[PDB]
Paper text:
As a type II transmembrane protein, comprising 274 amino acid residues, TMEM106B localizes to late endosomes and lysosomes. TMEM106B consists of an N-terminal cytosolic domain, a transmembrane helix, and a glycosylated C-terminal luminal domain (LD) that can be shed upon cleavage by lysosomal proteases. Here, we show that TMEM106B, a lysosomal transmembrane protein, can serve as an alternative receptor for SARS-CoV-2 entry into angiotensin-converting enzyme 2 (ACE2)-negative cells. Using X-ray crystallography, cryogenic electron microscopy (cryo-EM), and hydrogen-deuterium exchange mass spectrometry (HDX-MS), we show that the luminal domain (LD) of TMEM106B engages the receptor-binding motif of SARS-CoV-2 spike.
Residue numbers in the entry: 115 to 261
Write the structure that this text describes.
């Protein structure tokens, strides 16, 4: 059991996603709630200084969120962390309005690029853990979640 074992960050997926459309500005409003698994396999507490995440589409950042003072994670513990990222697809990518409001197809799946960076500090050292994962989202309807 050799320490310091680095924090373990697993990107789960999209728990919920609510969509709104503005006809006149030809924009999609896309609120994505992501779930994050953070595991501490050390026998000492470690604190998660902050989390910064950004939603990307067509190689273009469409949304961003910042979380501060997440929580202290005790020894051998893990925390499930949900964070919501409001995103907007408009202007240069306004063609997505037509596709996402397309009637001839019943489901409208697009691929978003999720980026997240978790900064943890232990014993006066700051470690940084980042991930990039591609994630499916349905931009043609809400994706809800009810326990
Ligand atoms: C999506 O997020 C924006 C900004 O946070 C908010 O104004 C809007 O009401 C949200 N829509 C839904 C359906 O939650
Ligand atoms: C994330 O953590 C929860 C809580 O322990 C667990 O049930 C779930 O399987 C984890 N997700 C993955 C993809 O392992
Ligand atoms: C996150 O926390 C670190 C350490 O406290 C700080 O230096 C940094 O400015 C914060 N924000 C980002 C985006 O790293
Ligand atoms: C579900 O999507 C529709 C699309 O027009 C939107 O009007 C509605 O607000 C969404 N649901 C919620 C709870 O926001």
């Amino acid at each position: 059991a050799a320490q310091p074992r680095s924090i373990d960050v697993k990107y789960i997926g999209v728990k919920s996603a609510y969509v709104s459309y503005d006809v006149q500005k030809r924009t999609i409003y896309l609120n994505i709630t992501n779930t994050l698994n953070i595991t501490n396999n050390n026998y000492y507490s470690v604190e998660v200084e902050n989390i910064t995440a950004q939603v990307q589409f067509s190689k273009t950042v469409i949304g961003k969120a910042r979380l501060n003072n997440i929580t202290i994670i005790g020894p051998l513990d893990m925390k499930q962390i949900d964070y919501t990222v409001p995103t907007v697809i408009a202007e240069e990518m306004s063609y997505m309005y037509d596709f996402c409001t397309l009637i001839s197809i019943k489901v409208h799946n697009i691929v978003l690029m999720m980026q997240v960076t978790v900064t943890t500090t232990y014993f006066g050292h700051s470690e940084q853990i980042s991930q990039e994962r591609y994630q499916y989202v349905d931009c043609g309807r809400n994706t809800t979640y009810q326990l």
